[PDB]
Design an enzyme around this catalytic site. Structure first.
Site, PDB file in Angstrom:
ATOM      1  N   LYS A 232      37.717  36.499  25.260  1.00 18.48           N
ATOM      2  CA  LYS A 232      36.310  36.929  25.095  1.00 18.48           C
ATOM      3  C   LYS A 232      35.651  36.812  23.739  1.00 18.48           C
ATOM      4  CE  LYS A 232      34.529  39.061  28.937  1.00 18.48           C
ATOM      5  NZ  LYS A 232      35.153  38.199  29.931  1.00 18.48           N
TER       6      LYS A 232
ATOM      7  N   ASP B 200      33.853  46.775  30.317  1.00 17.08           N
ATOM      8  CA  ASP B 200      34.944  47.360  31.087  1.00 17.08           C
ATOM      9  C   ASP B 200      36.287  47.020  30.446  1.00 17.08           C
ATOM     10  OD1 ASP B 200      35.053  45.027  33.969  1.00 17.08           O
ATOM     11  OD2 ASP B 200      34.996  44.640  31.817  1.00 17.08           O
TER      12      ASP B 200
END
Lengths: 392, 389
Positions: free
Chosen positions: A76, A119
């Site tokens: 990410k 999340d």
């Protein structure tokens, strides 16, 4: 053992093969030039699962292991850090192409505060970039988020607030607070009036695809297939955007993989229009990412809606390899693409599922393991305790 | 992260610390001399699970990996091949020390036929040795036996008969046919009038113990504990017999480990007298020769729930931290399984205290077999078959 796990496969009827203006080889090379300047950069391993491939009746299975991406344990930050660097360069009137990441860390100027809901991995990448660049970060997580993931963000010097609300209500709260305080919202998805940051994120992601292509060329292999797990479709869109520019969309059999409780792209894939819908961390979807959807609608070959337990299978298969294959640590959302292959192989309808997916003895299958054991408790429950078993 | 598997611990009330001169250092070394001469001999790895030890709260966990025992994928040949060589030397007036495999494989003349019942490993060892030494083997396997295990025996040039009877009823058929056709019964247990072969087998098994001692002394470590999985207690008796001669039975906390439905040694430990299971740990009646050693020198007996072994398989196959990976079958992993079950157990503190497990514990574990049934192995490690909950 022979078992039947829910696999729905739907051909992309809206396929046109129109490549993207925002997401191609050139921007990915630019992004990688940026990433190559960060302390601790190293292209993540591309693992050949030769013995598993022979078991599954394909030529090669290649897994991009993003658990090796700078100690963040997921892919990410490739997008998150890139978007944050871009924002800072823009605010300070700097040219990101002609400076080093270290130059940016010591850069002087008005401090920014970045706001995000996550999340797990996205917020961590944002928190990581913010800390490296001497800026602030305020990350919100939904109710029931694991304490380990919270602590990963706190250990990066960011505030991390655990709400009493679910994902979407927390996004709204992030947006409302950011307006109130003058913070910069950094989300990995797009909506009307918000496309700039998500674009950078998706361009940044393409670094992993550029690495994989280079590594494949070094190996003398050409992929025929790629499996891409998709929450809102930011990674899928960005990664496929790159690969489609290298290989052509007709000559790459791309498969998009979603859990059935959040198959927002799958459902959009059948209708042709955007279909709006807890989920395994990483693959949550409310609305599909409109920037990503454009690429998937145009260039994805097939969409899969699969059972949750398919991911757990993948975690185990990667974690305890076949024959002499290399071992890979892969979290739930990380492993679901590999899970699909394992699920097809043990399926009674193996033969026709393979023919549908055009898998045969010549297939070179590219798989992305997007995260490692980001929740160590959940990981070991699956691989040691047999939690989320096939039968249960 | 919290689960309770049944692990009954019983102190050995009948402990006396009397070692067995018969199963000690000298006999193991004699058997090792034999194995050393076999082509492709290499001591099996002793793997240090340092990161698992630190998680579990012990100093070290050391695993003897018998999946590397030649191409056999299990420890059993160590006893079976040794006993078969001794039988041949006895019958044909040969010297064990100068025995040539190449000569026996090609020699003309009188041949022995070795008859045995197995649920997998023992008979494969017998078939292997038979093939290597130019002899005949007839192996019987009970109903439901995995076809891969049948094929493995057939691939060794042996006859392999799969019956429609259980393990015990297949043993009697083996004995009936061997008496009828004049074959030599080679079983890895003892009964009245049948002790000589099992003795050699247990002495042969001790090669793994001699190897592990050499390896631990090369590491500069001393084991405080050993976990031994026991079917009839042949491996356990032979291995512990050796180990307590080296380390004394007072200075070595030995734990005998048995599955739920086959706990013949555990039930004998609580009483005091001799009283389809996971492949390799079937019992029915304890091995008298092995029983004498465990009764004397075993610190504790464990009767554990089945799924403890499935846990051990997965823990070995997908290691913690940077630990080395180990491929271990169901019976192979049950010793390691106990340690993992204790760790996650609500009674962790009182289980470790009961087992004298602490931060100074150096725990030796035997992985007796690898993935001898690959279908079963992958079902456990991939499909989550025999889950903890």
């Amino acid at each position: 053992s022979v078992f039947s796990l829910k696999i729905d496969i739907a051909d992309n009827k809206f396929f046109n093969g129109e490549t993207s203006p925002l997401f191609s080889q050139s921007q990915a090379k630019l992004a990688r030039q940026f990433h190559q300047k960060i302390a601790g950069y190293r292209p993540t391993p591309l693992c050949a699962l030769d013995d598993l491939a022979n078991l599954f009746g394909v030529k090669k299975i290649l897994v991009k292991d993003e658990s090796k991406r700078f100690g963040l344990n997921a892919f990410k930050m490739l997008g998150g850090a890139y978007a944050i660097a871009q924002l800072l360069c823009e605010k300070y009137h700097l040219d990101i192409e002609t400076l080093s990441f270290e130059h940016l860390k010591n850069a002087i100027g008005e401090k920014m505060t970045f706001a995000t809901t996550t999340d797990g991995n996205h917020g961590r990448g944002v928190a990581w970039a913010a800390q490296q660049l001497g800026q602030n970060a305020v990350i919100y997580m939904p109710k029931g988020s694991a304490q380990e993931r919270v602590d990963a963000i706190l250990n990066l010097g960011a505030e991390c607030i655990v709400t009493d609300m679910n994902y979407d209500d927390t996004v709204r709260l992030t947006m409302q607070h950011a307006q109130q305080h003058g913070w910069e919202v950094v989300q990995d998805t797009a909506w009307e009036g918000y496309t700039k940051i998500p674009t950078w994120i998706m361009q940044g992601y393409a670094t992993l695809a550029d690495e994989a292509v280079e590594q494949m060329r070094e190996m003398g292999v050409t992929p025929t297939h790629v499996l891409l797990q998709a929450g809102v479709g930011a990674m899928a869109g960005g990664v496929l955007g790159y690969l489609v520019d290298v290989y052509s969309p007709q000559n790459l059999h791309s498969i998009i993989v979603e859990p059935d409780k959040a198959d927002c792209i799958y459902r959009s894939g059948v209708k042709g229009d955007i279909v709006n819908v807890t989920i395994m961390a990483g693959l949550a979807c409310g609305e599909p990412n409109p920037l990503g959807w454009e690429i998937l609608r145009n260039c994805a070959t097939q969409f899969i809606s699969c059972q949750d337990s398919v991911a757990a299978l993948g975690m185990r298969v990667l974690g305890n390899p076949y024959g002499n294959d290399p071992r890979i640590i892969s979290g739930e959302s990380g492993a679901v693409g590999l899970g699909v292959l394992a699920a097809v192989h043990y399926h009674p309808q193996r033969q026709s599922l393979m023919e549908k997916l055009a898998l045969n003895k010549d297939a070179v299958v590219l798989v992305i393991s997007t995260e490692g054991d980001t929740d160590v408790k959940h990981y070991r429950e699956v691989v040691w305790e047999g939690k989320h078993a096939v039968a249960p």
